[PDB]
Structure 1
């Protein structure tokens, strides 16, 4: 039976007189660092000598190297890329982590790989948000939050749970719900979303766009319908609330609803389900983890090549033409991470 913590199940008492070192000031680090400060938690940033160090200083944080941040903290949040956990743990964290100190990862990968490990006298946990940085930050400022999963891997102090959930509460996850889930399950689940679901959603949008273009439809209009209008985006985000079939029922004309229900449950052949299983086997079997380590140890040059190639795909050429000629509703993001 699932164990889910909300605001009534956590407090900031565990953080009284304690310092949190946010290690890394990237997509997660910046949001955690911002939300912790605004919740009145004493917070530090530990970062290498790169652009994120300068950004942290620009947004008013105490910033040092990782070793000094860890040395001066009761709670350490390791929010750097997963392939870099091993070296930073062995060289910078493990040697400097105080007795009774808590170390938290935001993803189970490094724990499954044995790159981050329990240490005598210290607490090890996962607090893994189900959302990226900007949304977590905007939700927090509007008195809301996104969900998280947590796992208490090692608890020498016996106070690991209260401290992990106090961190979750300070960053806002308890406003949605923080659910117990093993670090190993979170790893395979998270990598599945990234490797099957997300690529497949975009491939499907792209297939809609490519067929419409081949069949002589206006490319701007084809792009707009398949996601560019924001309509498929809204259906999916409104669907998160009330349900996907329920969005079509509430919001679709009878013409739309009859069309939708003619093909609902019939569009995908069994080969899609079978690829999903192949992707899961690769994640669980160690094949992905090996591929990731290869792709990593060049400062991700093969990823740079892929990101640049993607921007010249027809869909993305058409996106730039539509966005130049159609204004999309956005919200000002300036000072979003400065003190509330």
Structure 2
């Protein structure tokens, strides 16, 4: 039966007179640092010599190299890409982590691969948010939060749990709920969402677009209906709240509801369910782990090629034309990560 912490199950008392080193200032790193600072937690950023170092400085943080940040920290949050954990842990973190210090990862992958390991007299934990940085930041400023999974991997102090949930409360995850889940299960779940579900959702959107265009439909209109209007995104996000079938029952015309229920449960052949199983096998069996280590060569050169190639896919060409001709409701993001 599930262990789920909300605000009444956590306090910031464990962070009194303690310094948190946020290692990295990327998607997660920047949100953690901003939210920790605004919660009145003593925070510093450890970063290599790149644009993220300069960004952290521009946003008013105390920024040093990783080793110096760790040496002056009671809690260390390793929020850099997972493939870089091994080298940074061995060289920068392990030699500099004080007696009784807590190390946290936001993904179980480095723990699964043994790249991050328990150290004598130190604590090791996972606090893995179920959301990217901008929403974590916007939710936090609105007195809300995103969910997270946590796992106490090594508790040598006997205070690891209090300190992890104090970080979770400070960054706002306990406003949603922080559930106990093994780092191994989090890794496979998380990679499954990225490798099966996200690609398949976009593949299906893209399939809808290309079929409509092949059948002589206005390409701007095709793009808007399949996602460009924000309607399908809105359905899915409202669905997260009240249920996906429920959203259609609440917000769909009777015409829409009859159409939806005609094909609901009938659209996908068994081959999709089998592909999902295949993706899980690759994740659980080390095939993906090997693939990711290869792809991280030449600083993710192959990924840079894939990102640039995707921009010329018909869906993405059609998107650029639609977004040039239709204004989308956005929010000003200027100074979003500056002190509140």
TM over 0.5: yes
Q: Describe the SS at the equivalent of 1:139.
A: helix
In the alignment, what sits opposite 1:187?
Answer: 187
Q: TM-score of the superposition, structure 2-length normalised?
A: 1.00
Q: Secondary structure at the match of 1:143?
A: coil
CA distance in 2, matches of 1:293, 1:274: 26
**How far 1:298 sits from its partner (Å)?**
1.2
Q: Distance in 1 between matches of 2:3 and 2:35?
A: 24
Q: Note the alpha carbon deviations across 1:180-200, whole angstroms, 9 max, x for none.
A: 000000000000000000000
Equivalences, count: 340
Give secondary structure in 2 for the equivalent of 1:151: strand
CA distance in 2, matches of 1:223, 1:127: 37
In structure 2, distance between residues paired with 1:280 and 1:30? 31
Residue 209 of structure 1, CA deviation: 0.1
Are 2:53 and 1:53 equivalent residues in the alignment? yes
SS in 2 for 1:95: coil
**Which string of whole-angstrom CA distances, capped at 9 and with x for unpartnered residues, describes residues 94-152 of structure 1?**
00000000000000000000000000000000000000000000000000000000000
Deviation per residue, 1:194-237 (Å, 9 max, x gap): 00000000000000000000000000000000000000000000
The Cα shift of 1:337 comes to: 0.1
Structure 2 distance, partners of 1:67, 1:130, is 28
Residue 327 of structure 1 and its aligned partner are, at CA, apart by: 0.1
Q: Note the C-alpha offset of 1:74.
A: 0.1
| Secondary structure of 1:261's aligned partner | helix
Distance 1:245 1:119 in 2: 48
2:242 & 2:330 partners in 1: Cα distance?
Answer: 24
1:148-190 CA-to-partner distances (Å, cap 9, x unmatched) read 0000000000000000000000000000000000000000000
- In 1, Cα distance between equivalents of 2:233 and 2:120: 47
Q: Quote the residue 2:246 is aligned against.
A: 246
* Matches of 1:155 and 1:263, distance apart in 2: 51
Q: Secondary structure at the match of 1:96?
A: coil
Deviation beyond 2 Å, 4+ runs, structure 1: none
Alpha-carbon distance, 1:336 to partner: 0.2
TM-score, normalised to structure 1's length? Answer: 1.00
2:77 is matched with: 77
1-structure distance, mates of 2:10, 2:325: 48
Instruction: Give the aligned partner of residue 137 of structure 1.
Output: 137
| C-alpha distance in 2 between matches for 1:277 and 1:39 | 42
Question: In the alignment, does 2:310 pair up with 1:310?
Answer: yes
Could you list the per-position Cα deviations for residues 300-323 of structure 1 after superposition, in whole angstroms to 9, with x for gaps in the alignment? 000000000000000000000000
Corresponding residue for 2:115? 115
The RMSD of aligned alpha carbons is 0.2
Shift, 1:297, TM fit: 2.0
Aligned to 1:158: 158
For residues 14-35 of structure 1, give each alpha carbon's deviation from its aligned partner in whole angstroms, at most 9, with x where no partner exists: 0000000000000000000000
Distance 1:8 1:80 in 2: 30
- For residues 68-87 of structure 1, the C-alpha deviation after alignment (integer angstroms, 9 at most, x for no partner) is 00000000000000000000
Distance 2:195 2:298 in 1: 21
Question: Which whole-Å CA distance do the structure 2 matches of 1:112 and 1:244 have between them?
Answer: 33
Q: Give, in whole Å, the separation in 1 of the partners of 2:333 and 2:204.
A: 30
**SS where residue 95 of structure 2 aligns?**
helix
